[PDB]
Each structure stands twice: as C-alpha cells, then as structure tokens.
Amino acid sequence: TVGDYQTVATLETFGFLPPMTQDEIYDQIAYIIAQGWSPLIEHVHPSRSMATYWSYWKLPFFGEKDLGVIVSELEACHRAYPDHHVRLVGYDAYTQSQGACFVVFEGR
Amino acid sequence: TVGDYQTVATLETFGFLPPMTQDEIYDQIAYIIAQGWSPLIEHVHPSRSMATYWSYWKLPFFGEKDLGVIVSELEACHRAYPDHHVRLVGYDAYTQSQGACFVVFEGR
Amino acid sequence: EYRDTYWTPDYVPLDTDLLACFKCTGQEGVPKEEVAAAVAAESSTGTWSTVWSELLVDLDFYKGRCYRIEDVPGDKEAFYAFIAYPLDLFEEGSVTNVLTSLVGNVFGFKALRHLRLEDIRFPMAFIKTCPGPPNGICVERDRMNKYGRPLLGCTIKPKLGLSGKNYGRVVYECLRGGLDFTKDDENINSQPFQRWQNRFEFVAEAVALAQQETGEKKGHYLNCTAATPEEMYERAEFAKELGQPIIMHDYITGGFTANTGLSKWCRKNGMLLHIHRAMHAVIDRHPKHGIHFRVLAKCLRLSGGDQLHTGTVVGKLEDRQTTLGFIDQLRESFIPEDRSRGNFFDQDWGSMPGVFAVASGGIHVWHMPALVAIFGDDSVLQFGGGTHGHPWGSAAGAAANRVALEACVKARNAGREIEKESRDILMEAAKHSPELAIALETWKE
Amino acid sequence: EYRDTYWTPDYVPLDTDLLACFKCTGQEGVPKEEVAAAVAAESSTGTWSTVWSELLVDLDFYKGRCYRIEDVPGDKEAFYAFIAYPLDLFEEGSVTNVLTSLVGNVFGFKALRHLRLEDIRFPMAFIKTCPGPPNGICVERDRMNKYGRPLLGCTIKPKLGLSGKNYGRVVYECLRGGLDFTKDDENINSQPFQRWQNRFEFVAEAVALAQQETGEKKGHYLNCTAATPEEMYERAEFAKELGQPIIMHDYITGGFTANTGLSKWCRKNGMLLHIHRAMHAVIDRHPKHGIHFRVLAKCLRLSGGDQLHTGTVVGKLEDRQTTLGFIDQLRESFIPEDRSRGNFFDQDWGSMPGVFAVASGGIHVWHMPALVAIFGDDSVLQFGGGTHGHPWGSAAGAAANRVALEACVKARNAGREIEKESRDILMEAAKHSPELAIALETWKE
Amino acid sequence: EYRDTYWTPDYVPLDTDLLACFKCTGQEGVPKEEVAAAVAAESSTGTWSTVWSELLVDLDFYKGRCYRIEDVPGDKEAFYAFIAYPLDLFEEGSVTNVLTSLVGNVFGFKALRHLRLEDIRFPMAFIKTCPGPPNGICVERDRMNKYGRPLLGCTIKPKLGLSGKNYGRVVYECLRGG
Amino acid sequence: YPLDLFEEGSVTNVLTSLVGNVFGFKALRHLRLEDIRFPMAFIKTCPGPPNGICVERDRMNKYGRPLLGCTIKPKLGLSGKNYGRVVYECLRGGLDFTKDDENINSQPFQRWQNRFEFVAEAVALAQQETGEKKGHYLNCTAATPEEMYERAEFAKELGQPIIMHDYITGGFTANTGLSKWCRKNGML
Amino acid sequence: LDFTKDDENINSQPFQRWQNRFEFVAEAVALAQQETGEKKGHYLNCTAATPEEMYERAEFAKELGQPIIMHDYITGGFTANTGLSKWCRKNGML
Ligand SMILES: O=C(O)[C@@](O)(COP(=O)(O)O)[C@H](O)[C@H](O)COP(=O)(O)O
Numbered sequence A, B: 001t002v003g004d005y006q007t008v009a010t011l012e013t014f015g016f017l018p019p020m021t022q023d024e025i026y027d028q029i030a031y032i033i034a035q036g037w038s039p040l041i042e043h044v045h046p047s048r049s050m051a052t053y054w055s056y057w058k059l060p061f062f063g064e065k066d067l068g069v070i071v072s073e074l075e076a077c078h079r080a081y082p083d084h085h086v087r088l089v090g091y092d093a094y095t096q097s098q099g100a101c102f103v104v105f106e107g108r
Numbered sequence C, D: 001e002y003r004d005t006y007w008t009p010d011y012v013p014l015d016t017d018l019l020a021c022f023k024c025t026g027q028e029g030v031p032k033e034e035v036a037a038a039v040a041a042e043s044s045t046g047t048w049s050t051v052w053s054e055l056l057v058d059l060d061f062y063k064g065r066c067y068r069i070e071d072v073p074g075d076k077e078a079f080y081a082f083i084a085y086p087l088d089l090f091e092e093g094s095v096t097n098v099l100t101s102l103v104g105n106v107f108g109f110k111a112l113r114h115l116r117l118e119d120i121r122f123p124m125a126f127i128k129t130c131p132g133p134p135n136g137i138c139v140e141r142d143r144m145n146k147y148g149r150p151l152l153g154c155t156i157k158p159k160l161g162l163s164g165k166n167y168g169r170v171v172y173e174c175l176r177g178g179l180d181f182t183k184d185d186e187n188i189n190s191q192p193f194q195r196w197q198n199r200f201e202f203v204a205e206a207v208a209l210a211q212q213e214t215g216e217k218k219g220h221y222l223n224c225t226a227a228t229p230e231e232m233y234e235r236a237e238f239a240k241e242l243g244q245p246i247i248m249h250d251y252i253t254g255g256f257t258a259n260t261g262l263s264k265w266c267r268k269n270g271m272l273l274h275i276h277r278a279m280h281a282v283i284d285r286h287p288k289h290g291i292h293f294r295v296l297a298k299c300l301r302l303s304g305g306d307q308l309h310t311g312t313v314v315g316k317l318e319d320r321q322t323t324l325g326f327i328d329q330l331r332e333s334f335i336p337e338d339r340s341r342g343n344f345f346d347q348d349w350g351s352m353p354g355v356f357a358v359a360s361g362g363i364h365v366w367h368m369p370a371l372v373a374i375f376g377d378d379s380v381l382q383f384g385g386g387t388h389g390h391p392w393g394s395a396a397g398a399a400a401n402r403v404a405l406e407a408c409v410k411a412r413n414a415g416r417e418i419e420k421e422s423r424d425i426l427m428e429a430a431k432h433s434p435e436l437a438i439a440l441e442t443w444k445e
Numbered sequence E: 001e002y003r004d005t006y007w008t009p010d011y012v013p014l015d016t017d018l019l020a021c022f023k024c025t026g027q028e029g030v031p032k033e034e035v036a037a038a039v040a041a042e043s044s045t046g047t048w049s050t051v052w053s054e055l056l057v058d059l060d061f062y063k064g065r066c067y068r069i070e071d072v073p074g075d076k077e078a079f080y081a082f083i084a085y086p087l088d089l090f091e092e093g094s095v096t097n098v099l100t101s102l103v104g105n106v107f108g109f110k111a112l113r114h115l116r117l118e119d120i121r122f123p124m125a126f127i128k129t130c131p132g133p134p135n136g137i138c139v140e141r142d143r144m145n146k147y148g149r150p151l152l153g154c155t156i157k158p159k160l161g162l163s164g165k166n167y168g169r170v171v172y173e174c175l176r177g178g
Numbered sequence F: 001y002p003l004d005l006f007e008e009g010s011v012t013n014v015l016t017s018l019v020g021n022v023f024g025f026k027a028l029r030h031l032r033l034e035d036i037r038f039p040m041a042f043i044k045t046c047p048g049p050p051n052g053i054c055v056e057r058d059r060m061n062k063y064g065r066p067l068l069g070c071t072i073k074p075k076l077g078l079s080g081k082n083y084g085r086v087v088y089e090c091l092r093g094g095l096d097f098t099k100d101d102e103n104i105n106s107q108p109f110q111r112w113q114n115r116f117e118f119v120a121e122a123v124a125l126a127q128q129e130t131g132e133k134k135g136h137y138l139n140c141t142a143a144t145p146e147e148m149y150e151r152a153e154f155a156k157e158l159g160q161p162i163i164m165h166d167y168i169t170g171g172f173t174a175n176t177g178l179s180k181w182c183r184k185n186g187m188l
Numbered sequence G: 001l002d003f004t005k006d007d008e009n010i011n012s013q014p015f016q017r018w019q020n021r022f023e024f025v026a027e028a029v030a031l032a033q034q035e036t037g038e039k040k041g042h043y044l045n046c047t048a049a050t051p052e053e054m055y056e057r058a059e060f061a062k063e064l065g066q067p068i069i070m071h072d073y074i075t076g077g078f079t080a081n082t083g084l085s086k087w088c089r090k091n092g093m094l
C-alpha cells in the first residue's frame, strides 16, 4: 500500500539500509583501521538489545593492522552465538569515544 | 582659607543661594500660579526639619489667582512662628506631585 | 508560495493588535508590496510551505498582515511597512517573547538588504500584564523627598583599582558636597582588587555618614549585575539589609529575563532600580540596520526600572527632536503621533508610571542652562569628571554644580531665558560662592 | 591628553592577557597609531582626564595597550589594531563582564566611523573559571547512544496555532519515522492558544511512545525561554520531572546572565542544552560594524550549551572558509592561527568539551552530500519542511532523510567522493526504498 | 452637592472602561437623571462633600459617569442606567476588588427602592490580568479523551451517613456502569 | 438539626447546609432565615474574635468612652503621600482611628506598599505629638489568600495595631483564615 | 593589646561550655573597645568534631558581633578549613 509508512524497529546506524555485503564489511573495517581506531566486537540477545553494555568478544584488537583477521573473528562470534546481534565498533583512545558503531549480523 | 570647602547644612532647593529678596518671592509665586498649581505654606521647628510632614498654614489656597494675598499670608506665618522655617509649595492636582518647594524664611 | 496573502491594504488594525514599523529596502526590481509582505510573513508564520500539518490550523487568524506602505522622505528605494500582529502570538507580561518573535529571525532573511525596527505600538491589553517600573517618578520623589528640581549624580573614578575603603572615601566626598547620588561604574562587579561585600559595606558607611551631616537623603547605585541570577539576588538582598535605597543593573548584557526578575523583586522589597544601557551602540547606532533605541526604551518601561540612561552630552548625543521624542515616551502617559520626533503611532500608557531620563557623559558647568532647557525637572544629570575635576577636590566640585543647577532653576521659574542668558545666570551666581567662581575659570567657556 | 601612552609597539603580551582584534578606520587625516590608541583607551580606562583622584592609583598597570598595527588586505583606509588587556580587569567566570567592558562603550566613541570586533584570545587562566558546556559532544553521544553519524532534527510547523495535543501529534510522526530530535520554534513560549504545561505534557507522550516503538532514544528541545528567571527554572524543572533529556534557550534575547544560570542548572541535573542564536543578524551581519559571530560563539562555548545554531543552508550561508573557521573553534581543543579562516590568534581550550554544530534552514535531500562533506559527524541537521514537505506525510518524509544520510555516510567511509558522486549515492539508494524514491522526484534536482 | 456632575449624556466610553448596567427605580417624583447620577456617584467617589482634601486630587478623572438612560420595556417607573468606570479604579487580576467597588455600598444607599446589577462589560486590558480557567473545555477533553458527546455525572446519595468505605462502594457502582 | 450534620469550627459549612438549597425550592414563594440558636458544643470549636472588647481596650488604653473614627476622602485619586497627609491631620486633631475605604485595594494611582508605608509615618508622628495611641485600619482584602497574608505581614512589620477585611465579598473561608492569623500575631 | 587568643585545646570542655565562653568574651571585648576607643578582638576557637558544629559556632560568633575566629587546619583537615574559609567571605569575618 502507498503511502502507508509503517514504523520499523531498527538498531541505530545503517539500520535503514539493507544488510551489508561481505565486500562492504571489508571497506568499513579498512576505514576503521585507517583512522587509527581499535576494532571491537560485541553481541547480545536481541531482547536485551537496549542494554547499556553488550558483551565483548574477546578483547579489543589493540594495534591490529590486518583486516583479514577481523573478518574471521566475526564469523567466530556469529557461529558461537547464532541468535545474537553482532556489532562492530571502532574505539578512539584520544577522544574516549567511538568513531564507528554498526551491527553486522542481525541474529538468526 | 582656599581651598578648604566646609560641608554646610542646607534645606534642599535654592539652599546654596543667598536668601531671596521680596521681589524674587513675587516672581516665584507668579510662576507657581501661572502653571495652575495651588500654593501651600508650611513650617517646622528647625530641629524637626527632616520630618516627612511639616505643619500647614492654614489650608492650601485652592483656586487663588492673586499673589498679593500670599505675600501677606507669609508674614503672618512668620510673625506667628518667629523660630520656624517657612516653606512655599506648589500643589499639582493632576500629577499628585509638587511643582515647587523652597524655603522662604529660614527661622530667626 | 508567492505571498500577497500577507499584503492586506484594506485591513483596519484592532485595538488589541501589536503594530510595528520597519524602514526597509529590498532587492532591485521586486515591487514594494512583495518585499513588505515577506517581512509580514517571516516575522509571524514564515510560510507557506506545503505540508499536511499546516492544514490542521486556521492560519488566516494567526497570520501577520501589512496594511500600509509609505515612502521614506528623502530616500527613494526605501519605504515604511506597517504590520499588524494578533495579540494571541505573544505571552502575557513577557518582553523576552515579544522581541524573540519580532526581531528573532527576519533580520537574517535574505531578500532584504536593509531592515530597521523603528517603532512598536503596544495595546492596553498587553501593557496591563507587564510589571512596569517598580516605583516611578512620583514615588521616587516621595521616598527621597526631592521636589522642584532635577537630581544630580556622579560616577566614581578611577573605575579600576580602588580598594573597598578608598572607594567609600571618594563616595563620601562627592555626597557631602552637594550631590545626592553616586554611581558604580558598569565594570565594577567583583574584581580581585575589590570584592563586592567589601565595596558594599564601606559605601554603606559613606552614604550614612553624609546623610546625617547634610541632613538630606543620599544614595549610591550599587551594581548587582552578576553571572548567575542566584548571585544577583544575593547582592540585592545584601544591599537591602544594609539599608540602601537604590541599586543598578545592565539590561542589555544581563538580559531581559534577569532584568524582569530583578524589577519584580524591587516591588516586594521597596527598592529603586537604575538601568544602564551598555552595548546599545552595537545595535542602535547605524541608521539603516538594527533597532532604534526608542523601541528598547519602550521595552524597558514595560519590563521595569525607574531610571534609564539616555545620555550622552558632548555637547549632546544629537537632532534634538529625535531625543525629545522618546523622552516623551519614557515619561508621559499618552503620546500622540508626530513624525518630526519620530513617533509613528499614538501610544497610550494608561496609568503606568514614568521613568527618569538620565543625561550623562561629560557635562560641565556651562552645560547646565542647555540641559535644564532640554530635559526639564524629571531628569538626572550624572557627571564623571564634572565633580571630581575641580582644582580643590571632589566636595568643592559637587558644591559648584549644585549652585549652578539651583541658579538655573530659579531663573527658569522667574520667566528668564536660561539657554540664552546663561552667562549672567552663572556669573551673578559666582558672586555668592567662591567654589563656583573658580569652576567657571577652569572649564572656560 | 593626546594618547600614544596606549600605543606600545614593543610590548609582548603575557600569557594571562586577554587579546582582541578590531577592524577599524577613523577620521580622515589622523594617523593610525593615534586612532588605534583611542580604541585602546576607550575600552579600558577611557582617560586621561585631569583629576586629583586618578593619582591614587597606578594606572599604568590597568591600562590596555595596542601592540600591533596591521593593514587590512584589499582596503587602504582600514587597519587591524591588536590590543592587550590585563587579566585583572575582568570578573572570574563572567562573560557578561568581558563584553560589557570591551564593547560596552567604544562603539559610541566619535572618532571612529567604523569599528568591528573580529576576534578575542582568552587566556587559560580565564577559561578555567567559566562553567563551559554542561555535557559536550562526547558526553551527549554517550547519554543518547548515537555514534558514527550526524544527528537529525526537525522544527515543528505551523509555528502558530496548534493546540497542545495536535502539536504532540506532529511530534510523534516525525520521530517515529526516522529522526531523533524535534524542535520548539523560538516563538513558542506560552501563548494563549497553547499554554506550556499543555505542550510539555503531550510532547512527553509523543516522545515516550516513539522511543519504545523504534527502540531508539528520541527527544524534543522544549523552549524554556521565559520573561523571568523564576519562570525559566520552573519550566526546566517541569521538563526534567517529565523525564525529558534536552531543553532549549535563546541566549542573545534572554541574555548571558540567564544563559549562564541555566547552563549551570543543567550540570547539577544532568540535562542537555540547545541554543538558538535569535537576533544575530542585527549585530553580526554587516561587514564593517558590530561583532563577528565568531566572538559570540566563543562566549557561548564559555558560558554553556551543548548545541548552537550555525545555519543556514540556502544553499548555505556563504565563503566556506569563514564558516569552517569558527566551526573549528566550537569543536576543537587547540586552534592554530590561520588568516584564510579568519583566526587571528592561536586559541587553546585545554580540556573544555566541544559544542555540536547545528546546520539549519531549508535543507532538502540533494543537500546531504554537501552538508556531510562540509560539516563532518559532530553536526546536527535540522530541516523545517524537509521532513514535513513529503507528499505522503511527516513519517514518510523523515524516513527519506534518514535513508539519504546513512547512504552518504557509508559512501564517505568507503573512500568515495560524496559531494562529487551525489547522484549515484542517492539513485542507488532509492532502489531499496520507495520513500526516498519519491522524495527525489519532488525536490528535483 | 446636587449631582448631574455624574450625568454625562455626551460621553463615549473608552475601550478600557468597565461598563455596568443597573435596572433601577427611585423615589417618587425625582427625575431619572438625578437618581441614575446618584448610582454613578455612590459606586465610585460617593461625593461631593466639602473638604479641603478633596481638592488635592483631579476628581473629574476618577469619577464614574452615566452616559445612557433607557426605559425598561413593560414597566414605567423603572429604567436602565448605563455607567462607565475608568480602568484605574480597580486592581489588576482581582475580582474581589471589582465587586467590592461596584456592589459594595450602592445597595444600601437610601434613595433607591430597587436596584439590580444586570450586566458588566470587562475590557480586554482587565481580562488579560486575571488567571481564567485552569484548563478549559478543549484541554479537559484532551486530558480525559472524551469527544463528540456531553459528559455524564452523578451525585452520591445518601448525603449524610455513609462511612468512607460504603461511599467508595457506591462510587464504584455508578462509574462501572457507564 | 442534629449536631452531627456540621463540621466543627466551620461557619462556611453551617450556611452551605442551611441556606444552600432551600431558597430555590419551588413550593415556597417567600422564605427568610430570621434566627439561629448555636449550641455550646459548636461555639467552643470556632475561633471567635481574635481579641474582643476588653482586650482591645487594654492594648490601646482607652476606657470609659466610645472610640472615634474617620474614613479618608476622596476615596479615588490620592497618592500614597497625600493619603498620609490627610491621615495625619485627622489623627493629630482628636480622633484615634482612621479607615481605608472598602474600594482601596491596590489601584494604579496608589499601590498598597506605598499607601501602607506613608500611613505608618502619619500614625507614628501623631501618636508621639498627642501622647495617645492611634491607628489606621489598612485594607488587606485581596484577590488571593497568598496576597492577603502578604499585606497582613507587611502591616505587622511596620508596627501597626489593626487591619481591615471584607467578609461578605471576600468570603468566610478567607475571613476565618485571617481571624486566626490575628491571634498568633496579636493584631486587631 | 588588640587581640587575645583561645588556646588550641579550648573547644567545649565540661568546666567551660562554648556558649558560655563566647558570651562573656563578647562583653569583655565590647567593654574594652569603648573605654580605649580602639577596635579590639578575640579569636574564638570554632574547631569542633563535626562541620555542622563548626558552622554553628561560627554563626553564634558572628551574631554576637565579633570580628575574628580561629581554626586548626592540620587536625581539622583541609576539607573543613576550606569550607570555613569560604563561609568567612560571604559573612565578612576574619
Ligand atoms: O572629558 C571630560 O571633559 C571629562 O573627563 C571631564 O573633565 P574635567 O574633569 O576636566 O571636567 C568627562 O567628565 C569625562 O570624559 C566623562 O564624564 P564622567 O567621567 O563624569 O562620566
């Protein structure tokens, strides 16, 4: 029906766009590393999705300059938790903030 | 001695100038009447000089257009009270204020 | 969206409307009706866009309309746009809201190269919701017992440096010599070299010791401008506890929100309020941009304050007709419409008290007959160096102005021409005062 | 009295001084050293007169001095006057005092035809006394959980007319469709057609019912500008009791005194503060008179507020170098000196948090790649009719901007040129959203 | 002291005045202009006496004046007296003051056998100082969500006797039923 | 009527019950409440006069004769200072009370903090010249009860002995709240 | 002399409570200020066990019209010393 817009539940960033291709994850990870940030993986049960602290996996990749490891550490968190959201974060140590924060896997 | 200025006790208006001549009282009274104000005479003991209400004499000259009566009603208040200040006032009925207020006789 | 839905030439403003005058000139080529219509729109509803929501409302009721176009005399590309606003657009007794609505946005709008708010007609329904002066002219003269003549003031100098005790030393000398007010300068707040509880307490002694020696009531406007409103009320309540009659505030830099909160604190506590118009020349000075000071005087009379700086006297701010125009509006209760004094509207204030007109900045003894002929009796005259600049000190300096003022009054009453016989109203006064006789030799002539 | 006692070409400013830049041109014939010296004097001690009292003080210590004269490039009669002020002249943590001193009087002084305050260097000793932003950029993103992208807003229209319940009806539709903020217009205070306790309560329901349906945190800046400071705090405390995260205030019309009292109320109560720069074009717009908006942005970062309007986007306020100049100063912690962006001084803020740069006024869907390339991520984008003006409503309108924003980000990260490939960053996004696919047809192109 | 200093047939009330209507009939024989003038006086300045103090004031400004006399239809000895009052006589946002001034004293005055306050015109300058309804019609319907129909109520009975718990018993039954 | 029908120390309740409704009832053409007998069990719950006759004569020291008063005129027009001018003249000539007229509340031409303060000087300057205690009933009728108490507390702080109120137009609820404020503060 | 001192030990001992010492000193100071014609003082010890108690003694001493007080900053702590030091600026005490 047009035009009847239905409110949809989203995560936050990149939520209105379709799920990312493997090649898109490559370029977002490469951008995160090229800014000098630290990657960090999280996950929750989709019901606890509004908790203030998700769950780590396993420790932030401090000083990692290779994106071929993070694309394999993302299938590990997903296979270990096939009903969890899998978030990707980019830690900024000088500002104490996050330069990136987008869900990669949505939770089967 | 110059220049050693001594603080002097004054009344308020026209206090820094010498005492007025009879001819000066004429012109101030004529100005008071020509504005449409009501003349009013007061007096106090020079010690009670900072009271908020002096003492009338006798009733305000409502609608008096003759200044030859007020110059004779000023010697009466003075002769009756030869140790009092004798003030001259000009009542404004539309503003509820005073358009004039100066001591005429200083108190023998 | 092309307007001329805001150009109503047939409309007759209600008695509850809020009128406004704008001196405007827009882009080259566009007709005047369109460009004044854009001023009507951008200061009220700022529309029409195309939304579903703008049809949930009767927007022909809240729209502001421009009912008259007139031509500026002496200029061709400019015009006068008179615009009417419904009384519902504004909050009651809020002057912060009436300016935020009017001048909040239209000045940035792109089609106008020049726009100046010249005047505003407030309706009697709006005036009665505002606090107004805490006391007024006639109540101040009652509380201080000063009748028949203008009041006199001085501003203590040096502005920067004096301790709390030397300050009170100089305050004591000007008061004991003939003046009845002294002023804190606008800068004096609570600097490291002179905290405010030390200045407030030593002034309270200089005022109370000169009031008893002269036998007249005296005062000093203590500056209660602060960084927070909790701090401002604290200084106000210190000053009232010390038994002081009057304080001071800066309304343009401290804001109308603070000025109105202070103005209504003064009515419950019976204090007087003196207002300083700091940073006025940033807005008001240039003849084609910003607001006229007239409009900021009306908003001040509506918000509060019993005295307001009008200045500026070297030898005066200069035309005189423009100044006498908004002195009327600060003092009178009904002001007709006169274009020479730049009153575009008939303004009725009903029973709201007036505000003292303070003249300031660089007066000397030969300026008295021109400042008594121009300003009248409901004025304050405040010199900075006129008192202090006398060869014999600050008490002999005040004693020379108080003699020259009372000689100019008593010559105005007796029918003489003060602004025309000024030299014999003064040289015949110096025959009976050696303090003025030497002041006339310095500031010659 | 002839000055050049304020023209010190050999002086080297301390690290505790407060520097200032003035773009000036004086009367014809007088040399530049004299006329800049007059600006040095009239903004500090305003002297020398000849008084007995001005010798009770060491006035060579409190004097303001002009240490550099430079020529404006592209103009001949104008010049740049750099003037240094001792730290003792000002009150600590008071921005109302720093402007009252500087721009309080010099603008009326007669020898200058044109004078513009361009910049001010604040010293680190002064910065640490001021409150600053109640939260800042990095704390706001923490409390709201919004990372990696700019925030989005809308201003509810019609400004004039909607009841408390229809207002919340339109607030609910824009929030539930993709935005995360809505705005009270500057006019909305407490008008007869919509009192503030009725607007505050029905918005609190539209915000709380859209936060739960989307699963994201949402807000609405409620306007707590009032006529008194007692009234302003009352609205702030109503809004906090309703559980709301953010409010709004007008600092130029409500004054810095009120703005600083509100800014420190927000720190003890954990609220966010959004600032609207109403009546800025009255002062800031004309290129030779008044203050630059840069200086009023520094004073705002010092007084408080976490977001500040910078506008104005049709298609932008326009040069871009001047705008990017004081966006640096609102956000960065150390800003070098660059004349192209009009920074005359090296300004260090130490550890004081930044302020969000709000772009506003007339954005539409084709402006996203130019407003993401220019402003970056620590920006808010606020349309008035960009959301509401969509053929299918206010929720389908918000859903089209949120899709076009997240398509421009994810193309900036991946190394593409957003402001240069804008049409394929958008047409390839409309292939996966019929809400944007129809928005691109309307606001063509 | 004979009045007809309060009978101004030529006056045109301002938009800030507070008008009033009185249905009156006075003693037998006295003309209507005098007796309506007495109502004008006794509800404002109640004068003139003869005092020194009553000349310290411009009393032609605070006086209330009667600008129109009209005849009651269906009665002969009665008339309608329309009287105008300056806005300065009243306190702002005070309705206790507007009645204390108007009906405070004139009803006891002896020359009138019958006097009835029928109407009052309040000016917009006075209305804006008063608080008014705390909510109103359109805000009550919003807060309660009741649209398109009149509301319904009941008054609990017996008025005298029920405990706090039996009261709530009967309140619960009327509400749960419609 | 049984004593249980009424609230204790409430006169607003005793009239609301009695004359609240019967006057509209249709079968009666004429009805007039002539008298009421109150029982001693009800009288003792009410506040009563804050002072009374014998306590007022004590506090003012006036014995053996009736008291004398005057009502200041013109009612409409006088400033706060001219008011006190006329108050001072009647007191200094032989009376012991003056009265605010019922209309005088806080009109534009004479606010109440200006009338209250200049009367306080006319009363205090005539009390010392005659050597007798003098007073002026200041009208503390207002539009709100918060405003009424504010005027009462201004008048007590100025050292004044007596005030005034309009009970039929201001209501028994306000009149009883003021009447019990006068007992804790010792005012008439 | 122009000052006298409370010893550091004098707080509020059983043999001499502090409201009794504060009040009789206020008379010895006020009766010597008038006889000599010079301003005189006595540092009253407002060191206590709690900060609520310290402020109470400070406000008693100011109400008695006294110009100066005393405190022990090493044993009473800098937290208490700074709270007292800023109470003295709003109240004009030494
Ligand atoms: O420029 C002058 O003429 C004065 O210094 C007076 O000089 P004299 O002392 O020689 O008379 C003015 O008073 C000040 O400029 C400003 O006035 P104020 O400081 O009073 O506000």
Ligand SMILES: O=C(O)[C@@](O)(COP(=O)(O)O)[C@H](O)[C@H](O)COP(=O)(O)O
Residues within 6 Å of the ligand: C049, C050, D155, D157, D360, D361, D362, D363, D364, D382, D383, D384, D385, D386, D387, D388, D389, D390, D443
């Ligand atoms: O002029 C325009 O283009 C708009 O009306 C949008 O039109 P559409 O609705 O047709 O897109 C602008 O949004 C407003 O002028 C100001 O913006 P805002 O009201 O958002 O502050």
Ligand SMILES: [Mg+2]
Residues within 6 Å of the ligand: C313, C314, C315, C362, C363, C364, C367
């Ligand atoms: Mg001059």
Ligand SMILES: [Mg+2]
Residues within 6 Å of the ligand: D313, D314, D315, D362, D363, D364, D367
């Ligand atoms: Mg655009």
